[PDB]
Amino acid sequence: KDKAKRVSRNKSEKKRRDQFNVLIKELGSMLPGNARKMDKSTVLQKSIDFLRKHKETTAQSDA
Amino acid sequence: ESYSIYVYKVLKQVHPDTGISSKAMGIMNSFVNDIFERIAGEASRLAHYNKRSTITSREIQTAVRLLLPGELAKHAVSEGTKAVTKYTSA
Amino acid sequence: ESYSIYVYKVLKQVHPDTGISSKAMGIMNSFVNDIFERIAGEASRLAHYNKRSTITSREIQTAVRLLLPGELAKHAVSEGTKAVTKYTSA
Amino acid sequence: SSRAGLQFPVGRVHRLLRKGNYSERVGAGAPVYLAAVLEYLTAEILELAGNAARDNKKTRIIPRHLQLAIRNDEELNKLLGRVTIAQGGVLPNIQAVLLP
Amino acid sequence: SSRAGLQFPVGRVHRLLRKGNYSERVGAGAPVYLAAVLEYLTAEILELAGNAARDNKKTRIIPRHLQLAIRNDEELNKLLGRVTIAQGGVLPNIQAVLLP
Amino acid sequence: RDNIQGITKPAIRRLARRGGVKRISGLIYEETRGVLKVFLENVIRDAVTYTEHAKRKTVTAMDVVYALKRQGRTLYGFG
Amino acid sequence: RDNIQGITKPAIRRLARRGGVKRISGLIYEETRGVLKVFLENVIRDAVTYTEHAKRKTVTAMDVVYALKRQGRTLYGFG
Amino acid sequence: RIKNAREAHSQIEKRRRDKMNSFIDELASLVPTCNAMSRKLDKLTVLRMAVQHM
Amino acid sequence: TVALREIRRYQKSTELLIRKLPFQRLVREIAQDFKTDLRFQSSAVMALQEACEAYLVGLFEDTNLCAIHAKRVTIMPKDIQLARRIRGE
Amino acid sequence: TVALREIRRYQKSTELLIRKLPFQRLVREIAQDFKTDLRFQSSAVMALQEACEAYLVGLFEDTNLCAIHAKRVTIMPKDIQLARRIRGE
DNA sequence: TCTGACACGTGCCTGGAGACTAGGGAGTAATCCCCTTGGCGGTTAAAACGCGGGGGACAGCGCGTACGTGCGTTTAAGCGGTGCTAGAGCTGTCTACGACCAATTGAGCGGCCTGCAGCACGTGACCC
DNA sequence: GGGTCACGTGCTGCAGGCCGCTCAATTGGTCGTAGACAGCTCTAGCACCGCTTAAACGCACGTACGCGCTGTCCCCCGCGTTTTAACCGCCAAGGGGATTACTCCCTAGTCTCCAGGCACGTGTCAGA
């Protein structure tokens, strides 16, 4: 019967996964050159490249 | 023994959202020990100079005034004075 | 109380043909008190560090080694050791 | 402590005052007076150290913050002038004559 | 003092150690050891001071002689490096660069 | 008031000479007086504090000796 | 033997830079090593003396703290 | 035989996690706010800081 | 140009600029002159390292000031010696 | 030539180089700042004077050395300031 | 011949010395655990070495002012003498607080367990 | 069959709660000393007055030192390349320190007694 309690814990694990999924959509949509159908790894990869580019550009403007 | 409990409580009262490292805490404990020795030593010397066998708030107050710089001396004395008056009353 | 009697006697035993002025003697008395405090202070601290309630010749001998320079310490320590040896032997 | 209104202990302070051969006798006010003083000084340092932490976006105090907090305060700097702080670092002071 | 072969008082040293808040207890041999040390150090100064008096054709020691004896002797000079001596005067030190 | 001026230029010259000084700029006299005044003020404040603690009206030699001693300067001959 | 050479010229330069030194003569390195050697000897000798008095064979941070403390130098964080 | 397909699947799934985790650490390093952290940030926090930073 | 950058860099950071291993050996090298076959706690050595750098840095600061007083840029042993003598060494 | 003879004379002698009444008034001038209507022992005041002169002599010696380091004979406040700073004043 | 210091003589009290007893502290012994010390292998960064150029330091020359030195005039400090009070020092008396000892109670800390949250892993579903 | 996403399970860590133990705080009682208060006396310090000598202050003149300017050479600084040590990670053994228990000795406290030490006065000697 106590196995039912695990469902709440399963929901908690799902909540963490869902928070990640929501942030992936926001993270991808907040980038320039937006594209659909990017997978989670691709969204992160393009986010990494964007931030490197953004850092490079602001650094390029100085010194 | 340590003051980590009391230091943390004071830190929370001043900075409710700020934590403290173990290294910083060790430093604060050394600080407190240092201050104690300075005052206790001077209070004893004052009693010696004045041929007294006991320590009272007067010896502590004078030791505080001698040891601390202008602003700290004034404020530390005020805190000591109230605590004794308040404790004595209660 | 003063050490003028003992200081004078020692001088006579070293230099029989000279004496000590009043000002010079006041200085020598100030000196003796200063040296006593320095050694006794360190001996007390050694007892404190090692959580001991008794001061013995060991704490004093160590205090002498810590306070005095090499050559002077060797001679001062030798005299202290001999005095105890002679005393306990006599 | 409770009646004194202090966070810091008094009973151990009383113990420490009578211990160590400071005096033959200790008055009731002395442990209390001192406990208030120790708490006061502690609070002042913690306040400044916390500020140093905030200036660097930290929520946690480290030895570097304690060093900065003290040396920037002339009363504390004098009081602790002979004190070395582990991992405290140094102030970034450069003489003007050395600059181009 | 006679038993120890000392000129300095043993009882007085014991009393000072016993009643100076240095510790709860004092060992019987401690006063003897210390009295010998104090006597030795005193003798070192007196020997030099007596020589200083002689070098000035004096038969009596004055504060200046103590100053001369102390500051010429390195071990004593370090020991009394921060001591001020009444009517001690100063040593006649002049820098060569100032001379013609 | 103004007893620091009581230390005349000749007084400074004598002291400077005792310290082995051969030649003196005109600004030394004022700098020296400023420093001396501050030095003395610190010593007296401690001596007076001792007198006040004892609730005395008269400052004694021991108040001075204790003041100098706690400052690091041990004095022989005055107790 | 010869562990003082283990502190290399670049190490000396880094220390001098922390001290705000812009330009360093070639004689500094030897002078600096001599100065440090004296400092270490003084602190260690006292720390060892404390250890010996306690009849111990292992030197602890407190022996160092006592050695420094009596030399007018205290250290927070190490005890 | 076909049992290997499930074993391969669990290894593929871990490889996907490892690739994402590697990117999360790299992404965190590019956000200045992460410099204030001593401990490694959790997956959700790093993504949140990246969008907050942008 | 580089020296100013180095000063800023080293003043900003908190880590030791000396090497730890030769320091540990040096402590024994010296300590053995007082007593042989000694054992040491690592915390004792670390305490020494912090004190040693702080000591030398303070001397460097005074040395630099002495050179500046003489209107010079470089530091020399003569500047160190003046600072040391004034400080009682 | 005159300065060297004066140095030798003042180093040779032991008397106070400051007039007493000006000194006594200065002490009372200061002491009144802390508390009014004070009384002073003469020996206490003389103890202060001896310490004060000893202090200045030490200051002058270091000041002179600083001027010498700078390859100068004349002492300036600049030299005093360096010596005082090095000694922590 | 006089003044100050040293030596000699006299008187009184305190401290030191000697004697005795008990408890607590110090010293000694045995056992156990952790840290330090010692050794081996690999990788990366630091240190060491070499080369070229510029700036800094040192040396030399010239000029002017401030400082140093001497003389004369004016003033204060120092020395000696006179007068009075408050504070300091000493003695005696009385009380409250602290110390010492015993007895209780409450809160907090430390350790252990439980619950919740987080991280990693495996399986199923969906898409190609 | 491969890759991604979604769902559930297993294990670990942190926070909260509970249990057990200790200390401090609290409460109560007794005894003595030290501190506080009161009274009395004397000295040193403070205040005031007068005179003389030396020092300080003011004025004038000249020199040396310090400052400013110019020129030359060497060392240090900066960069690049090569070699070694430092640093990092992993593994093993022994000794010292730490912890616990037991025994013995010394000092402090208490008690008793005397001389020397300390202070004061006189006489002689050395220096003035």
Side-chain angles (χ1 to χ4, degrees), chain J:
Chain J
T1 298
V2 177
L4 290 166
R5 288 189 275 105
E6 286 179 355
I7 291 165
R8 291 159 191 165
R9 183 172 70 252
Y10 293 125
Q11 289 181 333
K12 181 174 177 174
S13 72
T14 58
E15 71 282 348
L16 298 168
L17 302 175
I18 295 171
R19 302 279 59 88
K20 289 172 182 176
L21 285 177
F23 186 84
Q24 290 207 8
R25 289 194 301 267
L26 180 59
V27 169
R28 290 197 182 81
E29 176 182 327
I30 292 165
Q32 74 193 335
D33 289 349
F34 305 128
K35 183 169 190 186
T36 65
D37 305 291
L38 292 170
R39 300 154 50 90
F40 304 84
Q41 292 203 258
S42 63
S43 61
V45 175
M46 292 298 97
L48 290 171
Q49 186 172 341
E50 291 180 20
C52 292
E53 292 186 34
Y55 166 68
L56 292 177
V57 170
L59 183 146
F60 283 127
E61 184 175 39
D62 285 324
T63 300
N64 194 5
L65 292 171
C66 296
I68 292 164
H69 190 68
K71 302 189 179 181
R72 288 183 283 102
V73 176
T74 306
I75 57 163
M76 281 76 167
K78 295 189 295 186
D79 299 311
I80 293 171
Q81 291 155 14
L82 178 66
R84 288 195 80 214
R85 179 82 277 131
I86 292 169
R87 300 189 312 199
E89 296 173 67

